């Protein structure tokens, strides 16, 4: 039910977004034609009293009215797009909140990652479309132009929503467990390797810049990661299998026994389309036994 609703929502959003793209293109052609007509009128340089001059100025005003009608038509459709889009994220949010509840208590992720990737693609393409719309309208921006604030508020809202989504987009797929004895999870032993797995719900990554993920842990029994805490994922890996991180050799050393727990922290630096955001997440609490 929820998945089918999500599919219908994304389908209708794609349809009306294609319609919006067509409208933007048509407005671009109309603006170009008007600019050419004004240019050729200006280079004429014929100041006088003539019915033709009175005729051409009247039709010039009508062109300006149509440009405003087209320009104002883009915003509300974009505004309506944002309102409907904002419903999907808050509806998809508990699907992840309830997802981690089962882990604490089949564990497929394909639907969630596909939905998150689709949402990220929609957000990024909407941001690019707004950017090119602003660049187009900056040429002949004039008095009484609602775009000069509307586009900025739309970009602000889009950036805020994207940041909010990517704040929760980071989850830990697998808790650190030893491969030798998988019977007991969420338990740590000194001088041994541990296997962890983390996945990021959006399958988007630049093909020229690698993705960097760092890790961190936590007089309590403080422990330090003897092995390397840094890893690099090849850009082709995201296309081949996804943004998959595997640390199968992490070890911990020591610088009543079970009274307090330790938390391992994950930090990722996300860079795409000129926007950089800092993310931090925590794993399930664990206890170290010697």
């Amino acid at each position: 039910s929820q998945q089918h609703e999500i599919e219908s929502r994304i389908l209708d959003l794609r349809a009306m977004m294609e319609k919006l793209v067509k409208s933007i293109s048509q407005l671009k052609d109309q603006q170009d034609v008007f600019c050419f007509r004004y240019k050729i009128q200006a280079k004429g340089k014929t100041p006088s009293l003539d019915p033709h001059q009175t005729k051409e100025q009247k039709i010039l005003q009508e062109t300006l009215n149509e440009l405003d009608k087209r320009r104002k038509e883009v915003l509300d459709a974009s505004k309506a797009l944002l309102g409907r889009l904002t419903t999907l994220i808050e509806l998809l949010l508990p699907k992840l909140e309830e997802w981690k509840a089962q882990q604490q208590k089949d564990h497929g992720l394909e639907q969630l990652e596909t939905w998150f990737t689709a949402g990220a693609k929609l957000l990024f393409h909407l941001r690019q479309l707004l950017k090119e719309l602003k660049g187009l309208s900056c040429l002949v921006s004039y008095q009484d132009d609602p775009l000069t604030k509307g586009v900025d508020l739309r970009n602000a809202q889009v950036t805020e929503l994207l940041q909010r989504l990517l704040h929760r987009a980071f989850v830990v797929e697998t808790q650190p467990c030893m491969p030798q004895t998988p019977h007991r999870p969420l338990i740590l032993k000194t001088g041994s390797k541990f296997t962890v797995r983390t996945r990021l719900l959006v399958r988007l990554q630049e093909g020229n810049e690698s993705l960097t993920v760092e890790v961190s842990i936590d007089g309590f029994r403080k422990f330090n990661i003897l092995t390397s805490n840094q890893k690099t994922l090849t850009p082709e890996k995201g296309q081949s299998q996804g943004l998959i991180w595997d640390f199968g050799y992490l070890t911990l050393v020591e610088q009543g026994v079970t009274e307090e727990l330790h938390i391992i922290s994950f930090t990722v630096k996300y860079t795409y389309q000129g926007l950089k955001q800092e993310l931090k997440t925590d794993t399930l609490p664990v206890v170290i036994i010697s």
């Binding site: 170009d32 240019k39 003539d50």
Partner: protein
């Protein structure tokens, strides 16, 4: 500072969500969940345009203000207040003004109750308009701003604007923006002392503004009211969030309202039989309506009918898909479709047809009488009147000639050709002829329809918002029999009358203009007249009736009967939307011009010639005063006609109502007394402002054309017509309605795609567009269909052979002004209209527009031609 300043600062210091939730904290709302989407579908009744209608209803219901008589509206915008006021009982006329433009509200048309009393104006600035007489004044102008000083300045400017219009006994309702500072209170005190009133808040108003209104029937104090409003606003943001109290929207109904004044008297002894017959035919549903919106026309009754007509018009698909880059030009799309629904017909009839003129004085009457007598004696020097017969009319109808606007009486027959062969039609015609011979008419009625009701269409469709008069076939035949000789004998040809240009093709008026501009005198003047068809008075008809003095016998009797019983005594049917459905009314009038197309053309040419001669008379100073003409002036004016009267007629060129005059002295522009007195008021110019002339003959507009000149490669010189390309392209994409097929539309497209190859061959963007159409139509088909230019009686491009031979025959062999007769044998020796001039006249070449006119060329046009489908064709490019 006062408490209002504290409240404003506190509201300024707030969050987004808190601001959004503060808007609705006890105010009242109206459910607009129906009216909006009703308007989007296209409804024009039972709806409110905006939200101010509810506020105005709240004010009026408690009789705070009681508008009456004439009401003036400032900054109406869409016009909810004006539309609501129009439906009231004591309102007699509504006038409203608003400042249109980018990012501003604009009026839109509705058909609510009493919609025929409201007139709205756009694109006018209120601050620079002289005050006029008014009985009730409404003002709702104001824009919020975070800064208080600018709001105070705006309020002071508004008050300074409004203080002039108010009188002692005028009702008012004025909005004040920011009333909580002394910089407005000190003026408000004086205003209230001088005129009275109070400041009251509307509960429907939002919670985010401190707006107040100034009314008429109230009293109190200002500062205490502002303080208590501020205290209430302060207390408001302390309770819980209460749901908005929803109130249903207003419904206005529909219909038309009558004012109750009439200024016309009927002649029952002439039209009684026609009225009786019409009433007897539809006795079942005959009723009297008390809401007829006619003022200068009589009323007789109304019956029931079925609605005909449809908004917008069909679009020729064959020409479309070929002119792809033209779908974005606003002119092409806007003028494409018009309105012919009963609402549009009523709008046109109210706007233009229903007018009134004034009688002239004695001197002008005598002048036009003398001039008309002399002109009639002059024209009939080498021609004699005669009578037409039935064989000529049968040949005319059989060949589908340029017949006038006529319905083929569909109730019994299906077309004119089917009815001509029958005998009952001729029996009815003979009976009506016998009745007419005794000075009675019984079956002579008209029909009416409207067109061209959009914004930008009227600026590119000849003269827009017209009205054509249909007639029965028998009356058409009788009128032809009476007065066919005026056109069948070419009475108004250039050879007979030295001014008319009837019978001359479109490709020959430039030579005439060039020949005219070779004389000696001042400059060329090309003034026009607005609504010429409605400026004809009874005196002009009486003057034109003086042609019967050359007739005799039965011909004279028939001509007199036709002139007397039809042209100045008319009965017209018209439709009108009503709540009960659709109805038809019958009206009458004496003046104005309603007849067949050719007869109207001839009479208009004659009247224009007489008027131009009179104006040239006044320019030379032959007579001084027009109030009264005395002796020693009649002799003087008659000597002028005899001496050089003939020569002076050779300086002009009058096709219809279009005139071009080259006077001897520039005193022509300053003589505007007789012309204004006769009733031919000029267009878009001040009444007493002198007219503007031209010193060049290549820019004078005649028949909506500017005539350039061209130079061939050899050296020969031609003269070609020209026009704005956008208008031609927009016309070319409209189907007249004779289609419902592919063969018909293809034939029409091929028919008027050859006009461009014939006349408009000199421009790059139009010659190429015709080759594609000729190469897409499967050829072998006769391109027979009426395209346009009914006045121009050539229609020569309807042939079938190759266009090169036709061009050589037309522009070389039959050219009197061309000396040598060496023909051409290719399409490459014909030159173009320069390069910059083509762009100036409206092309799309030479600049960034060439980047979008880059796919509609031979680079990517072959696929477009092949896109037609299985319909074969033959290449021609």
């Amino acid at each position: 500072e006062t408490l209002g300043e504290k409240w404003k600062n506190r509201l300024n210091a707030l969050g987004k969500s808190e601001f959004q939730i503060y808007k609705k904290s006890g105010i009242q709302e109206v459910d607009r969940t129906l009216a909006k989407e009703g308007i989007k579908r296209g409804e024009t009744d039972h709806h409110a345009v905006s939200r101010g209608s509810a506020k105005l209803r709240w004010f009026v219901e408690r009789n705070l203000v009681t508008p009456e008589g004439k009401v003036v509206d400032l900054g109406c915008g869409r016009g909810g207040w004006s539309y609501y006021c129009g439906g009231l009982k004591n309102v007699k006329e509504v006038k409203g003004l608003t400042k249109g433009g980018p990012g501003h509200e604009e009026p839109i048309p509705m058909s609510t109750y009493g919609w025929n009393l409201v007139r709205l104006q756009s694109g006018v600035d209120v601050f620079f308009t002289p005050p006029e007489k008014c009985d009730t004044l409404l003002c709702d102008i104001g824009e919020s701003s975070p800064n208080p000083t600018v709001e105070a300045g705006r309020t002071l400017r508004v008050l300074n604007l409004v203080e002039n219009w108010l009188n002692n006994n005028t009702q008012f309702c004025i909005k004040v923006l920011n009333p909580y500072m002394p910089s407005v209170i000190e003026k408000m005190e004086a205003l209230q002392r001088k005129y009275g009133g109070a400041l009251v808040r509307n509960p429907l108003s939002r919670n985010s503004t401190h707006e107040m209104y100034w009314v008429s029937n109230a009293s109190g104090n200002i500062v205490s009211s502002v303080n208590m409003i501020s205290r209430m606003l302060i207390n408001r943001f302390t309770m819980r969030h209460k749901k908005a109290t929803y109130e249903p929207d207003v419904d206005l109904g529909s219909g038309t309202r009558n004012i109750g004044i009439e200024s016309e008297t009927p002649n029952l002894d002439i039209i009684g039989k026609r009225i009786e017959k019409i009433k007897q035919e539809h006795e079942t549903s005959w009723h009297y309506d008390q809401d007829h919106p006619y003022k200068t026309w009589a009323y007789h009754g109304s019956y029931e009918t079925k609605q005909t007509g449809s908004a917008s018009s069909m679009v020729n698909g064959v020409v479309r898909l070929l002119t792809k880059p033209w779908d974005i030009i606003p002119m092409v799309t806007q003028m494409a479709m018009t309105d012919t629904t009963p609402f549009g017909q009523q709008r046109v009839f109210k706007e233009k047809v229903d007018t009134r003129t004034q009688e002239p004085k004695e001197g002008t009457k005598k002048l036009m009488k003398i001039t008309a007598e002399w002109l009639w004696k002059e024209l009939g020097k080498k021609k004699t009147p005669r009578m037409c017969t039935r064989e000529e009319f049968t040949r005319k109808v059989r060949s589908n000639a340029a017949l006038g606007a006529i319905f083929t009486d569909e109730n019994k027959w299906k077309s004119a050709r089917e009815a001509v062969e029958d005998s009952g039609f001729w029996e009815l015609v003979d009976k009506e002829r016998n009745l007419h011979l005794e000075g009675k008419c019984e079956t002579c009625v008209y029909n009416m329809m409207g067109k061209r009701e959009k914004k930008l269409g009227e600026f590119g469709k000849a003269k827009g918002s017209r009205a054509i008069w249909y007639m029965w076939l028998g009356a058409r035949f009788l009128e032809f029999e009476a007065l066919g000789f005026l056109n069948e004998d070419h009475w108004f040809s250039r050879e007979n009358s030295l001014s008319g240009v009837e019978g001359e093709g479109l490709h020959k008026l430039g030579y005439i203009l060039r020949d005219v501009s070779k004389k000696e005198g001042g400059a060329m003047y090309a003034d026009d007249t607005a609504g010429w068809d409605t400026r004809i008075t009874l005196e002009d008809l009486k003057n034109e009736e003086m042609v019967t003095n050359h007739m005799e016998g039965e011909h004279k009797k028939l001509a007199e009967a036709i002139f007397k019983l039809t042209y100045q005594n008319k009965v017209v049917r018209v439709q009108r939307p009503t709540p009960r459905g659709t109805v038809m009314d019958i009206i009458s009038r004496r003046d104005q011009r309603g007849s067949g197309q050719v007869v109207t053309y001839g009479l208009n040419t004659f009247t224009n010639m007489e008027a131009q001669l009179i104006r040239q008379m006044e320019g030379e100073g032959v007579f001084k005063s027009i109030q009264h003409l005395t002796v020693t002036e009649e002799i003087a004016v008659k000597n002028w006609l005899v001496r050089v009267g003939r020569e002076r007629l050779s300086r002009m060129a009058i096709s219809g109502d279009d005139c071009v005059v080259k006077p001897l002295d520039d005193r022509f522009a300053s003589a505007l007394t007789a012309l204004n007195d006769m009733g031919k008021v000029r267009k878009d110019i001040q009444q007493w402002e002198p007219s503007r002339g031209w010193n060049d003959w290549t820019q004078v507009p005649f028949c909506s054309h500017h005539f350039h000149e061209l130079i061939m490669k050899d050296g020969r010189v031609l003269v070609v017509p020209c026009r704005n390309q956008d208008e031609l392209i927009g016309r070319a994409r409209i189907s007249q309605g004779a289609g419902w097929s592919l063969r018909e539309t293809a034939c029409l497209g091929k028919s008027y795609a050859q006009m461009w190859s014939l006349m408009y061959f000199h421009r790059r963007d139009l010659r190429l567009a015709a080759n594609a159409i000729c190469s897409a139509v499967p050829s072998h088909w006769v391109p027979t269909s009426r395209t346009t230019w009914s006045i121009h009686a050539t229609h020569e491009w309807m042939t079938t052979e190759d266009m090169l031979t036709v061009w050589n025959r037309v522009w070389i062999q039959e050219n009197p002004w061309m000396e040598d007769k060496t023909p051409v044998e290719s399409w490459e020796e014909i030159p173009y209209l320069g390069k910059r001039e083509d762009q100036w006249c409206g092309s799309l070449i030479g600049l960034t527009s060439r980047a979008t006119w880059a796919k509609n060329i031979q680079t990517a046009i072959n696929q477009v031609r092949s896109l037609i489908g299985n319909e074969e064709y033959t290449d021609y490019m």
